[PDB]
Amino acid sequence: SSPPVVDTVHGKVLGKFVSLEGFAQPVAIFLGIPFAKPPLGPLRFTPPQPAEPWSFVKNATSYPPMCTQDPKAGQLLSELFTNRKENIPLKLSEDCLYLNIYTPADLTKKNRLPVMVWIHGGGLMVGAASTYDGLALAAHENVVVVTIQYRLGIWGFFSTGDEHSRGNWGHLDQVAALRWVQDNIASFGGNPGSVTIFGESAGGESVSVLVLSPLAKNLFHRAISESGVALTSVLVKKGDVKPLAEQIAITAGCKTTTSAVMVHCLRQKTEEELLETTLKMKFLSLDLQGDPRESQPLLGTVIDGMLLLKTPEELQAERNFHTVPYMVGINKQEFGWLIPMLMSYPLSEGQLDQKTAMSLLWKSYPLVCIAKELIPEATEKYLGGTDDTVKKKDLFLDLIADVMFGVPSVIVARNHRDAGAPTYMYEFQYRPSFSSDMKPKTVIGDHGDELFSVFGAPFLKEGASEEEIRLSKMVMKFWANFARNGNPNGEGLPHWPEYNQKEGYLQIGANTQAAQKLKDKEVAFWTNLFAK
Amino acid sequence: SPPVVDTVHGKVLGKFVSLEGFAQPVAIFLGIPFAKPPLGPLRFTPPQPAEPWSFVKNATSYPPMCTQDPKAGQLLSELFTNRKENIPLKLSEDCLYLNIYTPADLTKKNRLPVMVWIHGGGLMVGAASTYDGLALAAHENVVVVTIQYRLGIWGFFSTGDEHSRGNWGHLDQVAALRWVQDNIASFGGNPGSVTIFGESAGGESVSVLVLSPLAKNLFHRAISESGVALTSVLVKKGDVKPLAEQIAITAGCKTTTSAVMVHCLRQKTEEELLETTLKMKFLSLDLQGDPRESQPLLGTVIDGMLLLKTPEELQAERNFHTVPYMVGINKQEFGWLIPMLMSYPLSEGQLDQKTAMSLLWKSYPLVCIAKELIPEATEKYLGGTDDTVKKKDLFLDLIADVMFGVPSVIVARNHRDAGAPTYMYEFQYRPSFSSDMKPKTVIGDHGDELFSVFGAPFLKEGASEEEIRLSKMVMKFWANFARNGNPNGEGLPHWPEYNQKEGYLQIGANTQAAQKLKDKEVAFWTNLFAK
Amino acid sequence: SPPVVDTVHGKVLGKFVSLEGFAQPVAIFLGIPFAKPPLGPLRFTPPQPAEPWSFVKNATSYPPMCTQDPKAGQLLSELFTNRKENIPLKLSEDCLYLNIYTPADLTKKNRLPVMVWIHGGGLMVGAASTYDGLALAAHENVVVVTIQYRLGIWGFFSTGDEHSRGNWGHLDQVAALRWVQDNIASFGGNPGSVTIFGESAGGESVSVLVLSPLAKNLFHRAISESGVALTSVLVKKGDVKPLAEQIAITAGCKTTTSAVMVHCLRQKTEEELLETTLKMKFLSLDLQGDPRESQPLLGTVIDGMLLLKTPEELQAERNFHTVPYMVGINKQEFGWLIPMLMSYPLSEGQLDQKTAMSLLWKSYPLVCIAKELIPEATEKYLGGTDDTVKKKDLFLDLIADVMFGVPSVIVARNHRDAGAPTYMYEFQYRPSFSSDMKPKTVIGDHGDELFSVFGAPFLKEGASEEEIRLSKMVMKFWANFARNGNPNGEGLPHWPEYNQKEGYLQIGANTQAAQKLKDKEVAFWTNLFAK
């Protein structure tokens, strides 16, 4: 029918209508709306700038490029995480500061539907907004869904530790996208007054970070972190970041005489060159050959003094900042298959013994950060139970998931709670039918498994059993009610308690019901073990 | 003693040149910047104000012409120039300059009428220095300004969106006019009386500016010689993304997104882009490959800043510059010059019906005649004689009418009906300065009026009495127009105003008024295209 | 606990260094940025303010020195340095830094006089890190600031127009002064009491800054050591365009226009410009061919921003804020250093009047003397007697007077006549830190006063009590001047002001007042050149 034409600050955008089985009002979908000026040339390694306005009508009907990244890794993850039946193949480009909108509202009348801005995960190295289709969630819960993109890897996080290149460019991209939503979402029938930010993994961590950043203040009113927070150490760079910067510059064929000299040279480099450098660094890949403490898993969030004035641990300790309803959750087996798979973890055996276990835990230093002097104690506290080598492996993946997501999430959850703001938690346990063929059937609640329920995968992909369909229906109700009231609860849905002193949380799965003291035992074990 | 003048951005030093018999010397200034050199980041972006210089800027040397095909550019400068010897020119992206020729007495105050010249060249080649305004300045006592603008890739690359809207060259023309309004007074010129005029692409430019709201108060009269906004070859209609992409690919750039192409194209050296230009083989009749997919030019587009609609839609709205406008054409626009420059296959010097239709199709990029209408067209023009030589000449008539004759007249009529003063002419004469390679039978070839308009007879050699007179007349007709938005004057054949009677001036050895210019042709084509 | 100071742009962290005989440690801050790195498009453009930093910048490591001949640079550093062992430096275009040495107790509120040092090196080489301000700071309780500024092509390339005015290094010097005004208070200094001083090109810089309306309020006292704005070699007169083109071609650039050259040179890499720098042989003397065509060393030009006209025209103009100015020279300015570093053909040890005139002519790029005047010049100095050996020395006194002696006095007199406190001196002493390859007969060689000024006798070893007392006295005089505009004080021989009696101080083992410095020489030359 007559295509939707929304008028924005920078110009008119033409999208398209797409109907979803069971909904009369078709959803207006806008693809590739620029929220900032392409970070090309001298704009590389600098805060994002406003997009130039355009004349006539902009055709927002093609999927935007995904920010330069490992094209193979990128696609692999996209296929593994997409909620649509046909994974969209994406093109690489530094000109990737776009966002996609899905509005279930009737643009012929004025609406103020709650807005949900999704920040994709990908270890801040890969990923894209197009991987996530917001059609189902928009129609079902009558909410405006916005998936956004931000610079990754070298382009979005290169830091020199100083003012010549603070870092966190990707994070600034995220904040810029949030301002754009403030200034334009009303045109798409959304209520700028109710913007909810939510993300998974690195996206969860980004959400966790904005919640702690003054720059993001008043840009959102509710937040959701799925399998990822600011205390998930692997994504936050503590200490002097100068060494990493130099290594990158050297690998790219640049002198390190000074900071400005390094940045100037990296700006002259072409995209293909910075990509080749990215590939040489072997990011997102477990480094077995070489000292574990020097291994650099990725380029991430730093304490730039602009976005983050100090460390997350210190930031969440304060109690004099703008608070918002925050939902933090994790999956049953955050390290059951997906992550170990992508990083090429040495587990082609199926079993593991105490001795070898202490070996991987050390090699995994860049992800867990457990001192070689604590390794023995840690590994024992987990594998000292059974003599079974197979059950040991399972407890090992438990060990890592807790350090990476479990404990960091509960702690963040607690502090937010002790800060006087509504806090909610959940533990997702369910093996989706859209899992990989290589993923063992015994893995339930793997990293990313909740994505399919959150983005209504059952209503776009085939095979979903009636059970899986309802699960997704329930999940979207919670997320959408949360977006609406800052409380997930609603009639016809299992009661979800607040994460107060009793530490109540919601176990989401075949059997969704409330529980208590999530990871209580582990938070204490690690809080002590780490305290050295 | 060297004339010096205070401009908005600093003092400039020029030179005095006297023309035969004239006591009052013409103060000439060559290579005055009117914009910041469009280099690096500034490429494919709107012209920017020039930076002021501290002391006295020496303006006594000719500026480089905008990057273009060195060969074609020189050839055209030689065929169109009106000075004795053609001057060698340098190429550069640093070409945003304008030359001034003022007959005024810079010591006292003057407000002579200003005439700004926009050279032609298909928007691909050309230069201001090609035209010496000495004769016209002295003879008609007007200040003559010749301006340059970005050409080809540099001045017209468009991604069809905000990353590279296009019409950079037209923006340069505007900036140049802007500069005249702020400085011309210092050169003895009256900024309140500015006439823009040019031929061919420069004629189309004048036409485009006459429809653009950006040039609102930048000129007061307009003259388009052999070229208007309706010469379809110069104005790209529809989506231009395809040609943008072809250019990027030819230059070794990815076409991922507009921003990607633009950025890549900016990282290219002037020389790589010129090489890309040479690769594209513009301004040449492409006899191989589908005619519908050949871009002989990179022209004007509907950018949304300079032009908000197509020139057609802009005429209808009777929404444009209601200033005195003079539109004229020459007897044989496709006489020799253009087909000669485009390597048209007419060696035999004859032409039968079939070959005519076949050639007309290949000429698609120039006339846009649907393959299904080619026969009616060829029949209407050629089915009248069995003389293969006449068919061949009638074929050049047809191309001429589609490119200039018809387009020009429709423009005049619309300009007329909008209530603004309008005038038309048809120049028919063979300048003695024509290239020796051009047959002596070609009368009123493309650009043939240039020699009268710029006083070639007074700077070059060999002009007969008849020719000398012709130039005097044309220059006066032109200068009078700049003064009153009316060409008439004492001692000049009467030029009726192009009103509903459609009176126009037939300029030549014998100059006399006539009516209904290309009237029947306009009717035929309007109908043929209505299908 | 290390020194942490807060400045407008952010917090800096230094280190304490104790000096023998002073309880309060001196806080030293190395490599604080006073401008934004002049890289990429910022090349050949005035310095821009540095960007603020978010935490505590570590300022405890020497900064790189502006790109220059690494060999000449290191050499001149070793020869001039006042510290025990010369510090090896790195080359970088990112060199706009300054070092601070404050003796003030930063936990208190001190406001001591500030002395900003501008090193020399023909504007081609040199570094701030060469001069350790420890001794001077502690001994005279003043804050010492050693600054850096762009050198060679980077700091002085000029097209003679607005596309690259030039004087970039001078604009850096001014920007360093601006920085000092906005931040020095947090280092214990009094922003209202800033004295700029330097030697050679650094002296010429001080001299230039004193005439520039750009620094009319950034300092309160000036000291030019062996070098003023009248030392022709460093200041350019006439069209500079040729030099620009010669540099552009040596770098492999087109020369179509100014913008073209500047644009192309901005695309060059630091190494490429360094390769170009070396190819030019800037500080060496050419013995072959016509001397007038010798490489005109890069230098100060009349840009129209820093200097509105030649220095000789600004001093008579009496147009420049009046501040106390101290101009001084050394006994044998062309004694050994400058010649040795320029590879002068004097290995002979003797010189007749024939080779002298030949050599003098060959010295045109330095002394700038007409060929028809060479005989007089020679005859006047060497004609005295025979003894070719005694003549080479009279030849050296010749060069010295033309480069520093005459210019200095002239400048002093003009300053004095401008009704401003003026002081002159002649340094005649041979530091024990002299090079081993320096003749024992050379006393008061170029750069010899630096060792007393920067208290070398308290950093290097072996200073005799006489040399120590000389250093104590010079520092006393300098600091006294920095805080009163008058060098005199308790425990010091009287230094008369340079009034009409032209009284100046003779500093050395024996320090006493004298009169009419180079008076006869200034007469001979002012005259000889008049012809």
Ligand SMILES: CC(=O)N[C@H]1[C@H]([C@H](O)[C@H](O)CO)O[C@@](O)(C(=O)O)C[C@@H]1O
């Ligand atoms: C008319 C048109 O194709 N618009 C498209 C633009 C252009 O492709 C870019 O601006 C490059 O020109 O942006 C998208 O491709 C994108 O980035 O997702 C989507 C949109 O459909």
Ligand SMILES: CC(=O)N[C@H]1[C@H]([C@H](O)[C@H](O)CO)O[C@@](O)(C(=O)O)C[C@@H]1O
């Ligand atoms: C002093 C001087 O030569 N000015 C001239 C400049 C320079 O030649 C270029 O900018 C290269 O510096 O530009 C012109 O040549 C030009 O292109 O029209 C004309 C002008 O008279």
Ligand SMILES: CN1[C@@H]2CC[C@H]1C[C@H](OC(=O)[C@H](O)c1ccccc1)C2
């Ligand atoms: C917080 N993240 C966790 C551990 C560190 C970081 C990267 C990893 O990434 C993912 O799960 C992504 O989904 C991904 C990235 C790259 C390739 C494949 C998959 C998961």
Ligand SMILES: CN1[C@@H]2CC[C@H]1C[C@H](OC(=O)[C@H](O)c1ccccc1)C2
């Ligand atoms: C084909 N697989 C081999 C043997 C059976 C099956 C599961 C096992 O994987 C794991 O325990 C981890 O889940 C893992 C580690 C590394 C890569 C992929 C998956 C490794």
Ligand SMILES: CN1[C@@H]2CC[C@H]1C[C@H](OC(=O)[C@H](O)c1ccccc1)C2
């Ligand atoms: C409006 N223009 C007419 C027809 C289309 C366009 C190009 C052509 O150009 C010329 O006559 C130029 O004068 C030229 C260009 C290239 C080479 C030689 C001469 C004449």
Ligand SMILES: CN1[C@@H]2CC[C@H]1C[C@H](OC(=O)[C@H](O)c1ccccc1)C2
């Ligand atoms: C016998 N002819 C002469 C020499 C070869 C052949 C074609 C040429 O004509 C052209 O190049 C022009 O295309 C032209 C000019 C004038 C009339 C007709 C055609 C003129």
Ligand SMILES: CN1[C@@H]2CC[C@H]1C[C@H](OC(=O)[C@H](O)c1ccccc1)C2
């Ligand atoms: C007024 N100066 C004199 C003559 C021109 C100018 C530079 C020269 O050199 C020096 O002062 C340095 O001592 C130096 C720098 C670079 C190379 C060699 C020597 C001495």
Ligand SMILES: CN1[C@@H]2CC[C@H]1C[C@H](OC(=O)[C@H](O)c1ccccc1)C2
């Ligand atoms: C390589 N040089 C040769 C032999 C050793 C050294 C000094 C000498 O120098 C001269 O004759 C100079 O003319 C001079 C230099 C320093 C002071 C006075 C005179 C000539």
Ligand SMILES: *[C@@H]1O[C@H](CO)[C@@H](O)[C@H](O)[C@H]1NC(C)=O
């Ligand atoms: C927008 O782009 C799509 C796909 O590129 C195309 O099919 C559609 O026609 C365009 N919209 C219009 C009508 O301009």
Ligand SMILES: *[C@@H]1O[C@H](CO)[C@@H](O)[C@H](O)[C@H]1NC(C)=O
């Ligand atoms: C400052 O830099 C110096 C030398 O680079 C280094 O030794 C010192 O540890 C640094 N100080 C701090 C604490 O950053």
Ligand SMILES: *[C@H]1O[C@H](CO)[C@@H](O)[C@H](O)[C@H]1NC(C)=O
């Ligand atoms: C133009 O005049 C300037 C200043 O007199 C001079 O430098 C330059 O050489 C002159 N150019 C010509 C055309 O001779």
Ligand SMILES: [Cl-]
């Ligand atoms: Cl992630």
